[PDB]
C-alpha cells in the first residue's frame, strides 16, 4: 500500500476503503505482507520481503494458476490439431456438479 505524504485526520476514512482484510480467500496472506511493511518499511520491504509479496499476488492476482490452466488447455488443442487426440476422448471424465 502507498505511504501517504501527510498523516492528517483525513486519511482515517480513505485508508480502510479497499483491503483483503474483510473475509477473503487469503487476506491472512496480505496481513503477513502488511505487518512486514511495518517491519522494514515500504522501501526495504520491496527487497527483504519479496517472498511474502509474491504469494499474495499469486493468490488474489491468480497469475500462474491461470497461466497453467491455459497451458493445459492449449496443449490439449495442439494435440487435437496434430492428430494425437481425436474423437469422443477429446475431453476427459467431467467432474460432478457439486464437486467444487
Amino acid at each position: 500500500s502507498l505511504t501517504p505524504f501527510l498523516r492528517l485526520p483525513l486519511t482515517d476514512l480513505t485508508g480502510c476503503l479497499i483491503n483483503h482484510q474483510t473475509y477473503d480467500k487469503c487476506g491472512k496472506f496480505e496481513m503477513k505482507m502488511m505487518e512486514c511493511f511495518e517491519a522494514y518499511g515500504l522501501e526495504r520491504g520491496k527487497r527483504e520481503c519479496a517472498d511474502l509479496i509474491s504469494d499474495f499476488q499469486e493468490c488474489v492476482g491468480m497469475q500462474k494458476q491461470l497461466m497453467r490452466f491455459h497451458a493445459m488447455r492449449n496443449e490439449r488443442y495442439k494435440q487435437w490439431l496434430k492428430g494425437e487426440r481425436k474423437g469422443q476422448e477429446f475431453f476427459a471424465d467431467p467432474p460432478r456438479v457439486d464437486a467444487y
Binding site: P4, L17, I18, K46, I53
Partner: protein, 341 residues
Amino acid sequence: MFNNSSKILFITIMIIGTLITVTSNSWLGAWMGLEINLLSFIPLLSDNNNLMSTEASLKYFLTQVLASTVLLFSSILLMLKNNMNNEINESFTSMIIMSALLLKSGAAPFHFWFPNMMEGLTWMNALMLMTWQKIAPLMLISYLNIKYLLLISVILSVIIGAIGGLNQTSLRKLMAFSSINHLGWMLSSLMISESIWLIYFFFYSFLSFVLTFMFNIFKLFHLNQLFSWFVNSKILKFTLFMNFLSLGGLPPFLGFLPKWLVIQQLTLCNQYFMLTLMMMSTLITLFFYLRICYSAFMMNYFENNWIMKMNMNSINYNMYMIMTFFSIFGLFLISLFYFMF
C-alpha cells in the same frame, strides 16, 4: 474573489479535497480527492462579468477529466497486474500514471492548456491555479521511481517555459510560463528529496502570493499597463518591483535560497548536467522578469497625466507590504531556519 460566502465554501472544500488527495494511502482515494478538488474548482474560474472565464473553465474541465480518467485507468491496470499499490520493478503502467499526473500539473509536453487558459482569467483564480492546484498532482508524483520521464519533463519545462514567455506581453500568460519553468525546478527537486521540494514549493508559493497581489490590487494585465501605473513616489515603485529580481533567483533577495538549496542538494546527489541545463535556461526567465522591470528601474517615465491618485485596497495591500519586506530582506532569517537539514 470574496464576492460571496459560497466561494469561501468552495475554497474550503477544495482545500479538503486536496488534503484527501495528498493523504490517500491508495491510488483510488487519491482519485476521489482529485474529483472533489475538481468539483470545487469548477465554480471558481467562472464568473458572469468575464466572457473568457467560462470557456477557460471548459478547457480546465476537459483537461482535468482527460487526465483523471487516464490516472484512474492506469491505477486500475497497476492493481490488476500487482494487487498492492506499490510496484517492485517499474513498468509502463507507472509511466501512464506519471503522464496523467503531468497533464494535471502542467509539465511542458502537456502544458499547452496552461497559458491558453491563463489568457482569460483574474489574478486570484490564477493565484489558486499555480499554487494550490499544483499540490494535488505533484504530491502523487513523489510516489513513483521512474527517472527518464522526470528527466524529460524537467528539461522540457526549463527550455519551453523560459523561451515561450518571451513573446508574451500579457502578464497572465507570462506568469503562467514563468510558473512552468518554476515547475521544472520542483520536479528536479522531487527526484532527490521530498523536503527540498517542500522548501522550493513553499517559497515559490510565497513569491506567487506577493507577486500576484501587485497585479490584483492595482488590476494590471499588460506590460504596457505597468508603465502607466501611477505610484506617488517612484522610489516605492522601484522598491516594489524587486520581487521580480527576488523570484528570478538573485543572491541578496529571498528566492535565491530555494534555488540554491536545490543546487546544493543536486550537486551532492551527483547530478551536474541537468543542473547546468536548468540554469542556462533560467536566465531567460530573469530576462522576461527584467523586461517587466523596465517600468520601475528607471527613475522617470513619460507618464499619462489624467490619473493623479493611487487607489488601492487596505487589507490586501496591508498583507502585501509584509510579504514584500520578507521577499527582499528574507535572507536574514536563514539562521533561524532548521528545515533544510
